[PDB]
Amino acid sequence: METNKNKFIEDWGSARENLEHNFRWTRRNFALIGIFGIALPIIVYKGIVKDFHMQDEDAGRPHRKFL
Amino acid sequence: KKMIATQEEMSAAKIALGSRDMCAHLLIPLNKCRQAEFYLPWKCEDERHVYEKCEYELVMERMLAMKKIREEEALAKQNK
Amino acid sequence: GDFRAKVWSMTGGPNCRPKHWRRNTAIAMFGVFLVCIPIAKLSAKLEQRPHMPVRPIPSQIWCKNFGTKDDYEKEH
Amino acid sequence: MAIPLILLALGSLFVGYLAKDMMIGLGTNFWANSLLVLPKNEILAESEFAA
Amino acid sequence: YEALAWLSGGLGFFVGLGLLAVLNDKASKVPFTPRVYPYDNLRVEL
Amino acid sequence: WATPGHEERPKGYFMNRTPPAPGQSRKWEDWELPCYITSFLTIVILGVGLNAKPDLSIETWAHQKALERLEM
Amino acid sequence: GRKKGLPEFEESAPDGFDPENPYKDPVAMVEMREHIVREKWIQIEKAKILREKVKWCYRVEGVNHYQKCRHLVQQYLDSTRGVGWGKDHRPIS
Amino acid sequence: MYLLIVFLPLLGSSVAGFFGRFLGSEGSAIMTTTCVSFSSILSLIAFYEVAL
Amino acid sequence: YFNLSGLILCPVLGSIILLFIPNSRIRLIRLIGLCASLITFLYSLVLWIQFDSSTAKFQFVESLRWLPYENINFYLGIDGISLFFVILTTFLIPICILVGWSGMRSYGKEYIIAFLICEFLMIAVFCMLDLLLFYVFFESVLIPMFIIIGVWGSRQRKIKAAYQFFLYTLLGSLFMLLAILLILFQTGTTDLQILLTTEFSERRQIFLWIAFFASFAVKVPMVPVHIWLPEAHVEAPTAGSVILAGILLKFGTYGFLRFSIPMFPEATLCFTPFIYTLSAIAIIYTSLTTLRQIDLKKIIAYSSVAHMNLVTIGMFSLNIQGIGGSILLMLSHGLVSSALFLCVGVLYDRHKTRLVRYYGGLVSTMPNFSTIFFFFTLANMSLPGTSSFIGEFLILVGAFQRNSLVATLAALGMILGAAYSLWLYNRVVSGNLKPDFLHKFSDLNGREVFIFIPFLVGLVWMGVYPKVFLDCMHTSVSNLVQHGKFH
Amino acid sequence: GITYKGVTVHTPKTWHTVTGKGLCAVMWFWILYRAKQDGPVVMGWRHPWDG
Ligand SMILES: CCCCCCCCCCCCCCCCCC(=O)O[C@@H](COC(=O)CCCCCCCCCCCCCCC)COP(=O)(O)OCC[N+](C)(C)C
């Protein structure tokens, strides 16, 4: 009942599993990791915090510090 | 022209808002006629033509009023 | 379907056409009728129809709620 | 598969005529709560006559 | 890349046609006065 | 339609369990009774328990107190 | 034991509670919290009752619904202004 | 009467899909058509009772 | 009169009795384990019926003194929130015993002993009101799940999965423990009711809340540490893979709903935007990552991460809609993920592939499993009428009461969730068959076709009528959201 | 039916061509009758007695 499991598949499966051996901090990929690791979280954080600030501005209540 | 039979008599029939124009008085017998029949396009004709007469006369009144106002507006575009 | 005759195929195989399907069809109609009777009973039990009909409709033969919601102040 | 074709043929030859008066009859009582027609954006009466 | 310009160009035709409608000024050439209704244009009805 | 047809029995076996010989039971599985009785008890206790339990909650209490208070 | 009925609760606000120092008295905290939540739910159900009333209005109202139910609309909206735990408008009870 | 219109197709499909072996390749089709046809008949009844 | 203590003791009795008998009589071991699990399940259902949903105070409390001063003690007790978790964890265990029923002769009595110990320990976690001892039982699940993963796991990488799982729950756990000790020394007791009614320093709540979140951001798959779940979940047995995504992922959220939201209300407000950003980026990143996966297990392990992250958006949006939808989606996920992982387990136990490309066009061969898989991946879509929709839409509604940006990204999460869910469905059950490596294979037998029936009925019962579940919790949720909010 | 030099077609059924011809005739009659009655109405030749 077990599948034949032809040889030309497990190699690619392990390459997808063992991709951790291919990483050398290339500059283009360094920028790619940096932007999606920091900038997008920062951009969205500004988005939510300013959404709260604008919501509170209309009601007239003072803005929370939001540390 | 003006109103003759409006307000509570108009309110009794479920007259569509916007369909309550100046000569909407005869629309109420018309709408009982539509409910009386099974909404036949050809059975009831005499009562529909008077309402189209209402609307048609209103439409000429509006177009002639605007043609008049355009007539004075034509004098406005005169730079000596 | 050489192998497809071995699967159960809950809704029917490739081309089933059982030996006696007409009797199954008839019992299916009977079951549908029997199961939709309580649906009809429930539907006739709960139906407001706030406005009275202009002409006698095939309703109010099993529905008793007619003009029961023109009292829109004692509403929970 | 010919009877439904016949029914749709007999439909799309008289349904429009039998429904023109009874859905849009320049003030018909067919949309008491189904539709809300704004008095301002109500170009039905003036359309048929001023066009 | 060639197919991309058609989407911009095709939409450019519509906004260009949309610009033409702006330049035509259909709004101010009505042959009719604004509608008048009894009871203060149905103020109690609104 | 008019013809009766063929395929005396529907193809395949339910649950892939081969039918036993005539005159013998299905030889119920060793967990079959302990789990079927569990299902039966759960169904009945939910049917008669969730309905015979009093309808005490904060929605109905608030409903009664809103009806009694809105009149003043 | 059970009262086999509606869960009667004390309408009276609990005593010994001070807004300036709520945390001073812990034994009185929980019943004040329960009373506040119960009153909020009373307001919620009042809003729901008004919503049901306008629900049954709109069917009977017909085309000219504005004319004879406008008074109830304001009553329903003012209830929705101080609703429970909702939008930025937090009521001050 | 009015609850029926929406549940006849659902019930007919449910039985014709759970027990499609019993009704075969033609019984299921004819019974689904029957159920939807009576659904349309009650739809016409509702149209008369509501529209006119 | 059935109390809370008997429910806890039933798995203990089942485990102690099971050790007395030898291993030769394997049928007795499996029978007694299943019987104990089922009677525990029935007891849990009985506890549901006699649950007062009107009052806000806790239900049955059993106090067993721990320190000589009665300073801290086992304070058991359920409420609207903890009851359904107890029911779910009592319901999942018999399923766990039943899935590996065929291989019981290969596993042995250690397998059922471990699972019943897990049931006991997991029940003790949810229904207790002592903050410190809840921490003790909170990571007490390390040992039994470590045994379950390691002894019966992958081929040779089972060692690494155990180490990553055990390592991620050490630094954050003890960094939480430090806050536990500061709370104990500051106030004096760890009783939950006492700790709720305490004035914490404004600057102090930030540190304590951060310490709590650090140990809950590992159980809940947050952005920094969530890579353990895919690898340690593929390298796990099928019955160990159905509680790992069924209960353990609830500890972080339940811990947030118990010892984080009430005790630190203004700290929760001050840290609200940060959690929103983390959850939104987690949803988006996991959604984009899961659509290029070939592992048969991670494909839904990432779906579990996405659902758990979406839970926190409305869990931290203080609102009756948000929290109620949070627990409803939590139960819905506890059912649907369990069902999906059981489907993956039955697929793997026949063919033994752990890939996605091997399977294809098997609808003509296993129609029953095809329908069941379609219904489960259909519930994962969050259709109205299914379990996930009511809870998840309630979360969206509650968050949109507070904020208008982040939960729009949460809703954008499902614009791709449904897409890749149906795409994943169409990898396997659609297309022409490939009988080059699929020579012989069967459909579900009587056991695993009946095992899904509780899942089906619970799913539809969630979908069409969730009022009974919302009925028992609206008091507890409303009390939770209004705590420390005098005005 | 019959073949020309290698292609043969079944004769169209009597119950199909007859209904097709008759139904086309009746819809043509309906169109022409509608033209006779309200033709001037939609072409502005005469208004439906409303002015
Ligand atoms: C959250 C859920 C909300 C409710 C959603 C219900 C929608 C229906 C869900 C199931 C749809 C059917 C999809 C099943 C998988 C599709 C492929 C398949 O496996 O079909 C099966 C089964 O086919 C079925 O579809 C039967 C399932 C029932 C379908 C009808 C569902 C009716 C009940 C649901 C709706 C009830 C009303 C709403 C309830 C409140 C076998 O098909 P065969 O024709 O036998 O092909 C044979 C295979 N082979 C060629 C290889 C030999």
Ligand SMILES: CCCCCCCCCCCCCCCCCCCC(=O)O[C@H](COC(=O)CCCCCCCCCCCCCC)COP(=O)(O)OCCN
């Ligand atoms: C293949 C064969 C399958 C057979 C299944 C039954 C056949 C019918 C198939 C249709 C599917 C039915 C699924 C149940 C739908 C119930 C929908 C109505 C439920 C409901 O709202 O009414 C409640 C009834 O409770 C109840 O009594 C409901 C009892 C349902 C028991 C289901 C047991 C599922 C156990 C799963 C456990 C999972 C745990 C996960 C946490 C109480 O309504 P009320 O509030 O008004 O109170 C009443 C006070 N007078």
